Paper text:
[name], the causative agent of the devastating honey-bee disease American Foulbrood, produces the cationic polyketide-peptide hybrid paenilamicin that displays antibacterial and antifungal activity. The pam gene cluster harbors a gene encoding the putative acetyl-CoA-dependent N-acetyltransferase [name], which belongs to the Gcn5-related N-acetyltransferase (GNAT) superfamily. We show that [name] acts as self-resistance factor in [name] by deactivation of paenilamicin. Our data unequivocally demonstrated that [name] mono-N-acetylates the N-terminal amino group at Aga-6 position of paenilamicin and thereby abolishes its antibacterial activity.
Here, we further determined the crystal structure of [name]:acetyl-CoA complex at 1.34 Å resolution. [name] comprises an N-terminal domain (NTD, residues 1–128, secondary structure elements indicated by primes) and a C-terminal domain (CTD, residues 140–275), which both adopt the characteristic GNAT fold. The two tandem-GNAT domains, that may have originated from a gene duplication event, share low sequence identity (<20%) and are connected by an α-helical linker (αbridge, residues 129–139). Furthermore, the well-conserved pyrophosphate-binding loop (P-loop) of the GNAT family (R/Q-X-X-G-X-A/G)26 is only present in the CTD of [name] (Q-N-K-G-L-A) between strand β4b and helix α3, whereas the NTD is missing this signature motif. Accordingly, there is only one acetyl-CoA molecule canonically bound in the [name] structure, namely to the CTD. Interestingly, a major interface in [name] is achieved by domain swapping of strand β6 (β6’), which inserts between strands β5’ and β6’ (β5 and β6) of the opposing domain and thus forms an extended, antiparallel, and strongly-twisted β-sheet throughout the enzyme. Although we did not obtain crystals of a ternary [name]-acetyl-CoA-paenilamicin complex, the position of acetyl-CoA, the well-defined shape of the neighboring pocket and our knowledge about the substrate’s N-terminal acetylation site allows us to predict that the Glm/Aga side chain of paenilamicin very likely penetrates into this pocket. Acidic residues D25 (loop between α1’ and α2’), E122 (β6’), and E208 (β4a) are well-positioned within the pocket to accommodate and stabilize the guanidine group of Aga, as well as to tolerate the Nζ amine of Glm.
Author numbering: 0 to 275
The structure:
């Protein structure tokens, strides 16, 4: 009769739905299932899930498991338009995003979101090539004197005159302490303000998903995100972390930056997005 919100203590019951290589390598999906990062899980049957909506609220939901699930066919719309919607909007969000592994889920999701003026896209997935990065980074533009690099610590996050960073981190991490213990991040600073950041938004074991941004529109295209990422990726290499970059096909600034940093294209997944 409805999709059921799953308690975190039962998340292990959906692990068996993570089966293909693309599913297994998807850091946000696994980070939410592991309980490590912020998200919600909805299932057909809380005792023995056969299909799940895994909402990595900072980035996308995923539909996994059996696309023929009758309850998903009749009540996926109800879950989107009330339970997902209300928690998104109350938390300052505006959008629904879904990412699919399996063509069979497309018609199921399309019937559920049909009246929405949704935008189809694809999410690009990569593999980081450390040797390429180490070769090509010598060509990156050096920072001029007004710009410096700082590792994200509690002082930086709590004293950003804009709560920009704190707000972004809250999409992914239940606390700043959890981010600082389990993740890492670096910023470009100018006039004592955070201009760019590169940080871990999800963790699955030694796999870290990247979030990058240059917040000051007028400072883009100067090499700032590149340098925040370069320091981040060096940290990852030094500490045995595999970084992951996934981005919408239409976000060509991000697609091109990923290629510049030594991320190599591997596969793409269909996405759907609308504004509530
Ligand atoms: C993995 C993820 O985080 S996915 C989400 C990515 N982040 C966002 O979408 C947030 C909004 N966008 C941004 O903040 C910025 O556009 C960013 C972070 C993608 C890039 O920040 P910038 O500070 O402008 O990047 P930076 O100047 O260091 O690098 C430019 C590189 O990025 C790509 N790029 C940047 N702008 C463009 C553009 N108009 N067109 C094409 N490629 C571009 C190019 O590879 C360019 O290479 P170059 O240095 O050889 O010219
Ligand atoms: Cl597979």
């Amino acid at each position: 009769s409805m999709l059921y919100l799953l308690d975190k203590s039962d998340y292990p019951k959906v692990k068996h739905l993570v089966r293909t290589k693309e599913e297994k390598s998807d850091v946000p999906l696994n980070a939410v299932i592991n309980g490590t990062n912020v998200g919600n899980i909805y299932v057909d049957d809380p005792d023995h899930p056969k299909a799940a909506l895994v909402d990595a609220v900072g980035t996308t939901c995923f539909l996994i498991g059996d696309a023929s699930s009758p309850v998903f066919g009749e009540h996926l719309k109800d879950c989107i338009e009330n339970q997902l919607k209300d928690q998104c909007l109350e938390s300052g969000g505006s959008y629904f995003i879904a990412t699919l592994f399996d063509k069979e889920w497309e018609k199921v999701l399309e019937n559920a979101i049909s009246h929405r003026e949704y935008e189809p896209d694809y999410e690009f997935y990569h593999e980081f090539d450390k040797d390429k990065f180490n070769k090509v980074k010598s060509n990156y533009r050096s920072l001029t004197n007004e710009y410096t690099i700082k590792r994200m610590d509690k002082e930086l996050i709590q004293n950003d005159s804009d709560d920009t960073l704190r707000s972004c981190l809250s999409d992914f991490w239940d606390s700043i302490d959890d981010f600082l213990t389990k993740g890492v991040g670096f910023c470009v600073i100018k006039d004592e303000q955070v201009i760019s950041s590169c940080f871990t938004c999800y963790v699955d074991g030694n796999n870290h998903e990247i979030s990058v941004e240059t917040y000051d529109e007028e400072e883009q295209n100067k090499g700032l995100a590149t340098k925040a990422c370069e320091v981040y990726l060096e940290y990852c290499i030094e500490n045995g972390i595999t970084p992951h970059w996934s981005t919408f096909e239409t976000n060509v600034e991000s697609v091109n930056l990923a290629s510049k940093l030594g991320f190599e294209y591997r596969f793409k997944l269909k996405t759907y997005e609308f504004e509530y």
